[PDB]
Amino acid sequence: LPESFDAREQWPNCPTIKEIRDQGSCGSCWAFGAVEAISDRICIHSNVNVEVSAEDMLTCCGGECGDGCNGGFPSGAWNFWTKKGLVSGGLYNSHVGCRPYSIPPCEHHVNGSRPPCTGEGDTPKCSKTCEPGYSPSYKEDKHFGCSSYSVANNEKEIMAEIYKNGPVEGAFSVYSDFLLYKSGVYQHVSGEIMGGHAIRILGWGVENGTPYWLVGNSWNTDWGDNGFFKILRGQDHCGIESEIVAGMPCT
Ligand SMILES: *[C@@H](C(=O)O)[C@H](O)C(=O)N[C@@H](CC(C)C)C(=O)NCCC(C)C
Known about the structure:
- By secondary structure, the protein is α+β, with helices and mostly antiparallel strands.
- It has a single domain (1-251), classed as Alpha-Beta Complex (Cathepsin B, Chain A).
- 19% of the residues lie in helices and 21% in strands.
- It is built from five helices and eight strands, in the order E-H-H-H-H-E-H-E-E-E-E-E-E.
- The strands form two sheets. Strands 1, 3, 4, 5, 6 and 7 form a six-stranded mixed β-sheet that branches. Strands 2-8 form a two-stranded antiparallel sheet.
- Helix 2 crosses helix 4 (74-83).
- The longest helix is centred in the first third of the chain and has 16 residues, at 29-44.
- The two termini are 25 Å apart.
- Bound molecules: ligand 1.
């Protein structure tokens, strides 16, 4: 394994790997970490560029994944992918894919032209139909996964998984001092705990002797380092290595 690795550069033909989405005022991170990583993997193991609908995951998985905008279980989301599959769907107001995201983007602890995020957003309905003008039908646009698994709390194994199969989904404990992240390798030094937050890990590296994980957040591009952040690697820091889930697309 190399000292550094960026999935964005290792797979130039898979643009989704470098895109950052916005969960809006909804606790749907569990669904985003998943559909983002899944999109990357569908592109990596079929070389087809397709943005998997976060809308489909968040609204149609049900209790098996948790409680919609109230939070969910990452590994459950990958399970739903292997059971029911996922349709395509782009960004809010994009009109791309079968089911585009229906929750408006917002400012996540930063100032901007967007409305501030307000954690109070309800889970949209599970509508099994594609937006008008889209083809094929909801049923026909389903992308299925052929396996759903959990990577061990092991740095080398997690690095190996990403190295061979692409980005994975993970989760960590967010503390108040993380909200203001801008650059460098994040390390929790103070602040109360805000709760668990699922994300997408697409690589690793070392910055001034400090090893880290290259992570993609779901709070838009004006947050952090263009939507991404780096976090201490090798110490299960604030749980970053304790909940790694991924899977493979059917061929
Ligand atoms: C993520 C978000 O910030 O939108 C969201 O809070 C979430 O999925 N939280 C869960 C923690 C996981 C990432 C480990 C969560 O709290 N859900 C588990 C409990 C639900 C009420 C079923």
